[PDB]
Homo-oligomer: A and B are copies of this chain.
Amino acid sequence: DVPDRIAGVAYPQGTTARRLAQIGAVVTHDGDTLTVTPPSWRPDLRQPADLVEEVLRLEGLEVIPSVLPPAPAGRGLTAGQQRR
């Protein structure tokens, strides 16, 4: 479900496995942990971040919501920034 986290979307079950199969990878399951051997024409697929972008682009980025994050109490501008 790492693609789900990063997108902030709950994709329908098995999405992430089907899409990694579609690009031609070998997906094997192991509880909550996928093992993904990408195919030979995809040397750009080397970490989970690479796998995330695959799932996310195939489902569409438009389905990702617009959620403002809790940003902490900032200190605002510094003295030198104010001076300029």
Number of residues on chain A facing chain B (CB within 8 A): 5
Cβ of A70 under 8 Å from chain B:
yes
Copies in the complex: 2
In the complex, chain B residues whose CB is within 8 Å of the CB of A70: 70, 72
Within 8 A of B (CB), among A53-70: 68, 70
A71, B68: Cβ atoms under 8 Å?
A: no
For the complex formed, measure the closest distance between the CB of A75 and the CB atoms of chain B, giving whole angstroms.
12
Considering only CB atoms, which chain B residue lies closest to A73 in the complex?
B68
Q: List 5 A-B contacts (CB under 8 A).
A: A68-B72, A68-B73, A70-B70, A70-B72, A71-B73
Residues of A bordering B, CB below 8 Å: 68, 70-73
